[PDB]
Amino acid sequence: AQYEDGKQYTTLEKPVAGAPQVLEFFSFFCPHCYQFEEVLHISDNVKKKLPEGVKMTKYHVNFMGGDLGKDLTQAWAVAMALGVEDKVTVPLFEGVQKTQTIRSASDIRDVFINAGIKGEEYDAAWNSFVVKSLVAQQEKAAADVQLRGVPAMFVNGKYQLNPQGMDTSNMDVFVQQYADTVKYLSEK
Fold it and tell me: Which of 1-26 are b and which e, b meaning 16 or more Cβ less than 10 Å from the residue's Cβ?
């Protein structure tokens, strides 16, 4: 076949019922995740090829960067609750991996303040129980699928993208192959 289990995707022998349709995992400490966001715009190009009415979910993970890693998962929860993912994703990536000016919870907060979210609003979000269960959702989803690596995308809780098995000579061709794979998996 043109798409084969173990080539552009692997199959979870333990499928995850009730999973989000297109589920993506990342870490602000993850160097391929940086590329996926800044250079490749994976999430966006995937969306552009998905049938519409499909929900796209993206979660942060704890297993990179120790204490800060966890802070970042709570911060991403704050971003999702406030709907400000598109405003903080890039300065969080660059603050962690490019400029190294993110070293504490307080530096993460600065990014949100500079992106124009208000102090009182961030801190209430940060400390709110809605954020707590959003943190719980992120951990549970990662836990459900045996996650030890990022970036990672899962389709319908049964299929996992396999980017090592695609061409990387050309960045644009890579993305398009990636997105077409998701679209195929979507229709399966």
Answer: eeeeeeebbeeeeeebeebbbbbbbb
Number of domains in the chain: 1
73 close to 139: Cβ distance less than 8 angstroms: yes
Q: What's this structure's resolution in Å?
A: 2.1
What is the pairing mode between strands 56-60 and 22-26? Answer: parallel
Phi/psi at 42 (nearest 5 deg)?
A: -50, -55
Method of structure determination? X-ray
- Pairing relationship of beta strands 159-161 and 56-60 according to DSSP bridges: unpaired
Can you list the pairs that 113-122 forms with residues at least 24 positions away whose Cβ atoms lie under 8 Å? 115/84, 115/87, 115/88, 115/91, 116/87, 117/82, 117/84, 117/87, 121/82, 122/78, 122/82
Cα–Cα distance list, 26 to 55, 128, 138 (Å): 17, 23, 11
Q: In this structure, what CATH number is given to the domain that contains residue 125?
A: 3.40.30.10
H/E run at residue 160:
strand 159-161
Domain extent for 58: 1-188
What are 160's two structure tokens?
């996992």
